[PDB]
Design a protein around this ligand. Sequence first.
Ligand SMILES: *[C@@H]1O[C@H](CO)[C@@H](O[C@@H]2O[C@H](CO)[C@@H](O)[C@H](O)[C@H]2NC(C)=O)[C@H](O)[C@H]1NC(C)=O
Ligand SMILES: Nc1nc2[nH]cnc2c(=O)[nH]1
Lengths: 246, 6
Amino acid sequence: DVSFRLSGADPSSYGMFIKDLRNALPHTEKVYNIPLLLPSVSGAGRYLLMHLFNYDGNTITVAVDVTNVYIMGYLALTTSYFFNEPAADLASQYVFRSARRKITLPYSGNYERLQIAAGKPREKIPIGLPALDTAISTLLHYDSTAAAGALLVLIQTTAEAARFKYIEQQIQERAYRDEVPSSATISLENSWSGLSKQIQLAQGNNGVFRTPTVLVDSKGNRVQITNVTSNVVTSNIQLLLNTKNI
Amino acid sequence: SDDDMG
Ligand SMILES: *[C@@H]1O[C@H](CO)[C@@H](O[C@@H]2O[C@H](CO)[C@@H](O)[C@H](O)[C@H]2NC(C)=O)[C@H](O)[C@H]1NC(C)=O
Ligand SMILES: Nc1nc2[nH]cnc2c(=O)[nH]1
């Protein structure tokens, strides 16, 4: 398991949590020095449990698929909650079984569905450590509309930060003040599967992407990523989604 | 690799 406590949290303790999260994800292989997530894991071992504590010390446990870093559901006291999707239903077979009741959320866990349920795109939802505190608090008691927004914050401050060093740094900057994600942040989130694929295809193509990936940079300018010498690849991306799962 | 805000 991994844990993160918002009480006393700072850029350093948040960095440690993201480190812990990354290190909890198994890999047999590194590709261009980036850990390659596994094609599959059988049984309960597929799911990492993240214990998150709000400023007041109240807690939720979040179930994360270790092959793709996908949040499946969470436990809040004696109630489990799962996305309305086959992968999450499968997860419910293995995690939080001892909950007194299981609620299926009235949406799947993808960004498009969550944004619809929340009534807001990510571009308009501030993120940061304070936002994460709010999200944990929201998830403690069932409210499907509020939960969609909370989940958008949760996903970006945990899984997306784990995937990209840039996103981790962005959350660190938002340790005491929330701010909407940068256009670069949104770009990276949207491109993880694409980037993972191209980095893997580059292995037998002399480090050249079979198809270039279009990204937005920190200055807000639209770059094109064509090979593994790119800063995205050498410094930013921290985990690779296995091409078997693309 | 880049950084701040947005
Ligand atoms: C591999 O990627 C680098 C970019 O990371 C490419 O070099 C850049 O692209 C053009 C010049 O061709 C300029 O706009 C950039 O300033 C270049 N940057 C650097 C640091 O060289 C390079 O052309 C790519 N190589 C291949 C084989 O696709
Ligand atoms: N549950 C979940 N949904 C997502 N939608 C986009 N990224 C993610 C993620 O990491 N987890």
